[PDB]
Each structure stands twice: as C-alpha cells, then as structure tokens.
Amino acid sequence: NDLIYQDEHASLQPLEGRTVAVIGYGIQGRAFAANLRDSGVAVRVGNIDDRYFELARAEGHRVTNIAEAVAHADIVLLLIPDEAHGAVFDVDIAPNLRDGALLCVAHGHSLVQGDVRPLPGRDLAMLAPRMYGDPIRRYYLAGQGAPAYFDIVADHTGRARDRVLAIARAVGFTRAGVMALGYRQETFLDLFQEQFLAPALVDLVETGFQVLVERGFNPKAALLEVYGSGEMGKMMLDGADIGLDEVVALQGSPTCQVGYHRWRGRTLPTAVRELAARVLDQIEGGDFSAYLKEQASNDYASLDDARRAALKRPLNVAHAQVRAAFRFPTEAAGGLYQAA
Amino acid sequence: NDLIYQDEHASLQPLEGRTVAVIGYGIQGRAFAANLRDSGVAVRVGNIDDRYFELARAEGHRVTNIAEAVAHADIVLLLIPDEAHGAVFDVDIAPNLRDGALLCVAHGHSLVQGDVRPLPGRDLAMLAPRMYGDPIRRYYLAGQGAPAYFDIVADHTGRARDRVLAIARAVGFTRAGVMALGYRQETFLDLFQEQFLAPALVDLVETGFQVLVERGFNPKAALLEVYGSGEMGKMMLDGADIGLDEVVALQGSPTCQVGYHRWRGRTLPTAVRELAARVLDQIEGGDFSAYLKEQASNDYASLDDARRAALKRPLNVAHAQVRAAFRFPTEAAGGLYQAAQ
Numbered sequence: 271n272d273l274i275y276q277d278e279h280a281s282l283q284p285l286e287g288r289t290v291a292v293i294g295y296g297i298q299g300r301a302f303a304a305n306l307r308d309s310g311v312a313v314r315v316g317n318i319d320d321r322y323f324e325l326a327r328a329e330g331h332r333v334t335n336i337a338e339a340v341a342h343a344d345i346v347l348l349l350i351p352d353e354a355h356g357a358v359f360d361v362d363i364a365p366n367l368r369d370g371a372l373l374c375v376a377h378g379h380s381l382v383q384g385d386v387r388p389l390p391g392r393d394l395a396m397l398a399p400r401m402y403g404d405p406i407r408r409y410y411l412a413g414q415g416a417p418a419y420f421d422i423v424a425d426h427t428g429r430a431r432d433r434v435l436a437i438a439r440a441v442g443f444t445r446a447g448v449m450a451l452g453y454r455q456e457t458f459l460d461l462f463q464e465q466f467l468a469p470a471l472v473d474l475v476e477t478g479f480q481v482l483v484e485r486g487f488n489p490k491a492a493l494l495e496v497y498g499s500g501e502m503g504k505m506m507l508d509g510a511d512i513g514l515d516e517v518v519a520l521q522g523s524p525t526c527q528v529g530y531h532r533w534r535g536r537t538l539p540t541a542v543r544e545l546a547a548r549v550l551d552q553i554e555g556g557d558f559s560a561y562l563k564e565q566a567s568n569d570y571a572s573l574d575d576a577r578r579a580a581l582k583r584p585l586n587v588a589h590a591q592v593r594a595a596f597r598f599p600t601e602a603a604g605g606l607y608q609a610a
Numbered sequence: 611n612d613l614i615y616q617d618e619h620a621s622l623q624p625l626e627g628r629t630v631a632v633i634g635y636g637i638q639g640r641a642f643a644a645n646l647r648d649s650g651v652a653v654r655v656g657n658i659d660d661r662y663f664e665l666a667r668a669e670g671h672r673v674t675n676i677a678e679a680v681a682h683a684d685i686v687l688l689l690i691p692d693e694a695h696g697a698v699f700d701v702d703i704a705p706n707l708r709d710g711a712l713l714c715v716a717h718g719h720s721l722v723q724g725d726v727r728p729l730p731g732r733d734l735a736m737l738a739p740r741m742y743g744d745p746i747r748r749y750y751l752a753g754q755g756a757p758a759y760f761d762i763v764a765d766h767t768g769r770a771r772d773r774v775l776a777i778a779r780a781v782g783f784t785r786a787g788v789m790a791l792g793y794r795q796e797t798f799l800d801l802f803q804e805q806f807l808a809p810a811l812v813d814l815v816e817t818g819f820q821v822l823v824e825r826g827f828n829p830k831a832a833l834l835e836v837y838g839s840g841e842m843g844k845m846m847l848d849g850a851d852i853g854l855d856e857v858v859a860l861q862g863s864p865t866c867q868v869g870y871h872r873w874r875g876r877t878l879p880t881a882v883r884e885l886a887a888r889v890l891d892q893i894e895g896g897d898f899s900a901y902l903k904e905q906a907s908n909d910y911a912s913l914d915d916a917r918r919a920a921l922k923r924p925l926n927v928a929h930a931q932v933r934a935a936f937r938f939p940t941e942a943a944g945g946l947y948q949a950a951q
C-alpha cells in the first residue's frame with residue numbers, strides 16, 4: 271500500500287540550525303537552491319569553475335568548490351549529471367561529509383551503478399522530483415509544487431526520513447505528494463519515460479506533420495495542429511488533472527469526440543508495445559548504462575552532434591517559420607530565481 | 611507566401627454600432643460571447659431550450675431562441691455542433707439573416723457538405739480557432755490569444771474580410787496570428803488532428819502505462835511518469851513555444867538527453883505512417899462524414915456508450931487513484947467567464 275507525504279506529514283523543524291549544500295546549480299540545483307532560500311533554510315552552493323558558478327553568485331548565493339560546500343553542510347544535495355557522481359563522490363563528497371550528515375541524489379542511477387554508496391556514520395537517500403526546474407520554481411512561487419519519489423537507502427542517525435521530507439517540504443514537493451519508491455524502480459521508470467515515451471510522443475507529432483506535408487497541406491498549419499498551436503500540449507497538461515479521455519469528453523465538439531472515439535485504442539500496432547519492452551530490457555540489463563558512459567567520456571560531443579542535427583529536421587525548420595510569424599503566450603522569466 | 615494577420619493588421623472599427631448574435635453557448639460559444647462582451651462589442655446569445663440557455667442567462671447575456679437573435683444581428687456566429695448546422699441554417703438563420711449580414715462558421719465541415727451555403731445579399735466566412743474554449747478565454751484575460759484560420763467564402767458587401775478579422779481581434783486570435791486557409795483544407799486538417807494525432811498520443815501514453823504495470827511497476831508511479839505528473843504535458847506545451855527537441859536540450863539532464871536521442875526518430879514502425887494516410891483517405895473521400903451522420907442520427911448514443919466505456923479502462927481507473935492521492939496545481943476556472951475589462 272503506497273506511502274504518500276503531503277504538507278500535513280512533514281515540517282521544517284528538522285532543518286533548524288542546519289546548512290544545506292546544493293552541489294551543482296543546473297536545472298534542479300538552481301530550483302532547489304532558490305526554493306530552500308525562500309523557505310528560510312540556510313543554503314550554500316558548491317560548483318566547479320564554469321558558467322553555473324557565476325550564475326549562482328549573480329543570484330546572491332554563497333558559492334565555493336564542491337569540497338568546501340560539503341565540509342560546511344549538514345545536508346548535501348548532489349544535483350550534477352549522473353555519470354559525474356562517481357568521481358565527485360570519491361574525491362570531493364565522501365572525504366568531507368560530516369558525521370550525522372545526509373547525502374541526497376535526485377535519481378537512482380548512480381546508486382544502482384554503485385558510484386554513490388552508504389558511508390559509516392552518515393545518511394544516504396533519494397528525493398527524485400517528477401518535473402524539471404522552471405515548473406518546480408513557478409509552482410513554488412504560486413504556493414504549489416510537483417510530485418517526488420523518495421527512498422531512505424541508509425539511515426545511521428535514525429533521522430534521515432524527517433530530514434528528506436523537510437527538504438521535500440521546503441522545495442514544495444509535499445504540496446503535490448512525496449511517495450516512497452525504491453531507487454532501483456525510480457531509475458528504470460525515469461529512463462523509460464526519457465527513452466521510450468518522450469521520443470515516441472515527438473516521433474508521432476513528427477509523423478502527423480510529415481504525412482500532412484507529403485499530402486500537400488500548408489506546412490505552417492500542419493505544424494500548428496500537431497503541437498505548434500499549443501492545443502495538443504494543453505490536452506496533455508489538462509489531461510494530467512481530469513484525465514485524457516475526459517479532456518476530449520469535456521472540451522471536444524461532438525464532431526471531434528466521434529472522430530477521436532473511432533480510432534481511440536486502435537492507432538498503434540503491437541510492435542510499439544514490443545519496442546517499449548526492448549527499451550526496458552536495455553535499461554535493466556546494463557546496456558544503456560554502458561552506452562551512457564561511452565557517450566559521456568568526451569564531454570558529451572556525440573550529444574552536441576545530435577542536438578545540432580535535430581534542429582535541421584523538417585519539423586524544427588517549420589517550427590522556426592511558425593514561431594517567427596505567430597506570437598505564443600509566454601510568462602516573463604527574469605529574476606524568477608532571485609530571492610522572493 | 612502565407613497571409614497572417616496580427617493586431618496591427620485588424621481593428622474594432624467594423625463593429626462600431628453592430629450586434630453579434632452568438633448561436634450556441636457551448637465550448638466555443640461561451641468563449642466568443644465573453645471575449646466579445648469584454649472587448650466592448652454588443653453581443654446576443656441564440657440558444658434552444660437546454661442548460662446552455664440557462665448558463666448564458668446566469669452569466670448575464672441577452673438570450674432568446676436562435677431565430678430572434680439572428681433577426682436582431684448584423685454578424686451571426688454559428689457555434690453549435692457541425693451536424694446540427696443544416697437544419698438550423700434552413701429553419702432559423704437563412705430566413706432571418708438581414709441584407710449585408712455576415713455568417714461565420716468555426717469549422718469548414720458544414721461548407722464542404724453544403725449544409726451552409728452562400729445567400730444572395732449576405733457574407734459567409736470561416737473563422738476556425740486552433741484551440742478549445744477555456745484556453746481561448748484564459749489567454750484573452752492575460753492579453754494573449756490562440757491562433758485561428760479564416761476564409762472569405764462569399765463577400766456581397768465587400769466588407770466581409772474587415773468584419774471577420776474585427777471579430778478575430780475582439781476575441782484575441784490576432785494577438786497570436788490569424789492565417790488565410792481554405793475551409794476545405796481546414797476541415798481535413800482539423801479532423802486529422804482529432805482522428806489520427808490525439809488518439810495516437812493517448813494510445814501511446816496508454817501503451818507506456820500498460821507495459822510498466824504488466825512488468826510489475828507501481829501503478830501510481832507509472833501513471834504519473836506517462837502523463838499524470840504533468841511533465842509530458844509541460845514538455846509538449848513548452849515545446850509549442852521553443853520546439854520539442856529544444857525543450858529536451860534546455861531542460862533535460864545529460865542522462866535524459868543521451869537516452870532521448872538514442873531512440874528519437876526510431877520508435878515508430880512504418881504502419882503508423884500508413885495509418886495516418888488511411889485516416890486522411892477516410893476524411894477526404896467522405897467516409898468519416900457518412901460515419902459522423904450515422905453517429906449523429908442516434909442523438910450521439912454510440913458516443914455516450916464509448917465515453918462511459920473509456921472511464922473503465924485501466925489508465926482511467928489508475929487516473930482517479932492517482933488524483934485522490936496527489937494534489938495537481940490548477941487555476942480556479944470558477945470565475946473564468948465573469949465580466950472583465
């Protein structure tokens with residue numbers, strides 16, 4: 271039976287007189303660092319000598335190297351890329367982590383790989399948000415939050431749970447719900463979303479766009495319908511609330527609803543389900559983890575090549591033409607991470 | 611090259627001293643009515659004797675039967691289901707449409723089928739928003755808009771275009787962009803999104819949930835990752851702004867990016883391409899239109915059954931379980947259609 275913590279199940283008492291070192295000031299680090307400060311938690315940033323160090327200083331944080339941040343903290347949040355956990359743990363964290371100190375990862379990968387490990391006298395946990403940085407930050411400022419999963423891997427102090435959930439509460443996850451889930455399950459689940467679901471959603475949008483273009487439809491209009499209008503985006507985000515079939519029922523004309531229900535449950539052949547299983551086997555079997563380590567140890571040059579190639583795909587050429595000629599509703603993001 | 615109107619390309623001058631009859635107070639009707647009212651346009655609602663009639667009165671609109679609203683209007687927006695257009699046009703609109711009056715549809719279907727036709731002495735246009743009612747209304751109140759396609763079908767007065775684009779500005783569509791597109795192409799494009807893409811997107815989310823649960827993953831966690839968390843919804847909506855591959859490049863960890871690009875462009879078999887082609891054929895050759903008419907004739911009895919059947923699929927059973935347990939952040943839609951500035 272699932273164990274889910276909300277605001278009534280956590281407090282900031284565990285953080286009284288304690289310092290949190292946010293290690294890394296990237297997509298997660300910046301949001302955690304911002305939300306912790308605004309919740310009145312004493313917070314530090316530990317970062318290498320790169321652009322994120324300068325950004326942290328620009329947004330008013332105490333910033334040092336990782337070793338000094340860890341040395342001066344009761345709670346350490348390791349929010350750097352997963353392939354870099356091993357070296358930073360062995361060289362910078364493990365040697366400097368105080369007795370009774372808590373170390374938290376935001377993803378189970380490094381724990382499954384044995385790159386981050388329990389240490390005598392210290393607490394090890396996962397607090398893994400189900401959302402990226404900007405949304406977590408905007409939700410927090412509007413008195414809301416996104417969900418998280420947590421796992422208490424090692425608890426020498428016996429106070430690991432209260433401290434992990436106090437961190438979750440300070441960053442806002444308890445406003446949605448923080449659910450117990452093993453670090454190993456979170457790893458395979460998270461990598462599945464990234465490797466099957468997300469690529470497949472975009473491939474499907476792209477297939478809609480490519481067929482419409484081949485069949486002589488206006489490319490701007492084809493792009494707009496398949497996601498560019500924001501309509502498929504809204505259906506999916508409104509669907510998160512009330513349900514996907516329920517969005518079509520509430521919001522679709524009878525013409526739309528009859529069309530939708532003619533093909534609902536019939537569009538995908540069994541080969542899609544079978545690829546999903548192949549992707550899961552690769553994640554669980556160690557094949558992905560090996561591929562990731564290869565792709566990593568060049569400062570991700572093969573990823574740079576892929577990101578640049580993607581921007582010249584027809585869909586993305588058409589996106590730039592539509593966005594130049596159609597204004598999309600956005601919200602000002604300036605000072606979003608400065609003190610509330 | 612495309613014809614795309616924004617705010618600097620339209621004005622409210624063509625609506626000075628003119629009345630708009632909104633026919634229907636549904637998803638589109640309620641949104642048009644509110645945005646028109648708030649933009650300082652005199653508006654009336656024409657509606658049959660159902661709950662939408664009472665809703666329009668409760669939200670403070672002048673409501674009558676369709677015939678009276680049309681008879682007292684310079685511009686008429688036909689915002690009822692597409693299969694009801696034929697009988698309402700013949701009985702309520704055509705005999706009461708003033709000389710020099712404009713009739714607009716928000717979808718090209720009734721025009722393709724010939725159920726709404728040009729009338730001597732009058733203007734006929736399509737103004738088809740690329741968005742449903744709630745977002746249209748929320749965007750408007752934020753000083754933003756949804757995109758729309760327009761087509762001038764008949765222009766007796768010579769003022770059809772100015773008036774269509776005037777309505778578009780009043781409702782907020784020109785804050786995004788209003789593009790000239792033929793009613794026939796809008797019909798097939800709009801139906802294709804509804805009949806191929808939207809089902810495929812939900813079928814794919816469903817496949818994700820099903821494979822995870824059948825391999826013994828926590829059902830609540832599986833539901834959350836495939837859409838329930840809002841993350842995949844946020845990726846698609848943010849992607850509308852900056853691009854889908856760009857969202858993953860800006861917001862995804864290096865782990866996420868390496869995984870995404872390992873399978874991006876390799877997930878779908880050719881069968882999904884061929885299905886989209888099959889759906890376009892059914893739409894273009896009149897097979898869907900025949901199907902919709904058989905469906906409409908039953909008072910949408912089959913639609914009621916499928917809607918109730920869908921609530922019992924494991925995905926939607928897991929949805930209610932997740933939503934009872936996790937709080938999802940949403941704005942109060944309660945005041946959304948109340949009078950504004």
Ligand SMILES: NC(=O)C1=CN([C@@H]2O[C@H](COP(=O)(O)OP(=O)(O)OC[C@H]3O[C@@H](n4cnc5c(N)ncnc54)[C@H](O)[C@@H]3O)[C@@H](O)[C@H]2O)C=CC1
Nearest residue numbers: 294295296297298322349350351354376377402403862863
């Ligand atoms: N991307 C997301 O929104 C989410 C991230 N996570 C997890 O959170 C953690 C942080 O991920 P992101 O914020 O996306 O990462 P990111 O790509 O934004 O990481 C940037 C930060 O990592 C530091 N960094 C990078 N390589 C380093 C190295 N070799 N040594 C030291 N510091 C280094 C940079 O200085 C910078 O502060 C990861 O474990 C990730 O799996 C999980 C949930 C959501």
Ligand SMILES: NC(=O)C1=CN([C@@H]2O[C@H](COP(=O)(O)OP(=O)(O)OC[C@H]3O[C@@H](n4cnc5c(N)ncnc54)[C@H](O)[C@@H]3O)[C@@H](O)[C@H]2O)C=CC1
Nearest residue numbers: 521522523634635636637638662689690694716717742743
């Ligand atoms: N659903 C959407 O978000 C969008 C709809 N459209 C188009 O807008 C038009 C309106 O569709 P929705 O607002 O979604 O429909 P809806 O299902 O919300 O329509 C409800 C309204 O239609 C009236 N109505 C229903 N049957 C009627 C009949 N037989 N005679 C007279 N009035 C009747 C009701 O009294 C009520 O006012 C359609 O042509 C549709 O294709 C296009 C763009 C977006």
Ligand SMILES: CC(C)CC/C(O)=C(/O)C(=O)O
Nearest residue numbers: 505518521522523526741742
């Ligand atoms: C409910 C969403 C997915 C579709 C709404 C839409 O854009 C239409 O043309 C219609 O419902 O007829």
Ligand SMILES: CC(C)CC/C(O)=C(/O)C(=O)O
Nearest residue numbers: 401402845858861862863866
């Ligand atoms: C950017 C979206 C699709 C994913 C963000 C997320 O949930 C992760 O675990 C990650 O980036 O590593």
Ligand SMILES: [Mg+2]
Nearest residue numbers: 399400401460
């Ligand atoms: Mg994730």
Ligand SMILES: [Mg+2]
Nearest residue numbers: 523526717800
């Ligand atoms: Mg439609």
Ligand SMILES: [Mg+2]
Nearest residue numbers: 739740741800
């Ligand atoms: Mg549509």
Ligand SMILES: [Mg+2]
Nearest residue numbers: 377460863866
């Ligand atoms: Mg991840």
Ligand code: NA
Nearest residue numbers: 515516519917
């Ligand atoms: Na429903």
